[PDB]
């Protein structure tokens, strides 16, 4: 099986953030599976692989753009299809960065939930 941790970054400050500011760390470990696919889950997924999406603040409803970092995307092993559905795959026993996507974002002080789906892949 897979052992998954999604770890929020400490010390994030409201206001103008750096481009690609790190906001969470995804940790996936396994003794049995060599790879995994991952997709973001929200009310507005914005690309064909589900690796960028938008999330809403609990107290304000304001949206921010989030996703895998450019560096993390370049570490993908492949993009595979599960009954026609794209999933980008990555090595198990590794970590990936979730970031604020695109150009610098001005983020309103709030709590923003992030949800990911992870599935084992045997290449």
């Amino acid at each position: 099986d897979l052992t998954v941790s999604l770890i929020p970054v400490s010390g994030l400050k409201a206001g103008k953030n750096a481009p690609s500011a790190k906001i969470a760390k995804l940790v996936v470990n396994s003794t049995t599976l060599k790879e995994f696919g991952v997709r973001g889950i929200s009310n507005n997924v914005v690309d064909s692989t589900g690796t960028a999406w938008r999330v809403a603040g609990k107290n304000t409803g304001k949206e921010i753009g989030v996703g895998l970092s450019s560096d993390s995307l370049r570490r993908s092993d492949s993009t595979e299809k599960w009954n026609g559905v794209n999933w980008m795959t990555f090595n198990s026993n590794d970590t990936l960065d979730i970031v604020l996507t695109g150009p610098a974002q001005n983020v309103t002080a709030d709590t923003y939930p992030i949800t990911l789906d992870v599935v084992g892949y045997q290449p």
């Binding site: 998954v4 999604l6 970054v9 969470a24 999933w87 709590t111 923003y112 992870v118 599935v119 084992g120």
Partner: peptide, 19 residues
């Protein structure tokens, strides 16, 4: 290759931006 449907999991976390 193949996906392992029994291994699929959803994981969530709260990201906090403070004033």
């Amino acid at each position: 290759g193949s996906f392992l449907p029994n291994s699929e999991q959803q994981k969530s976390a709260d990201i906090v931006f403070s004033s």
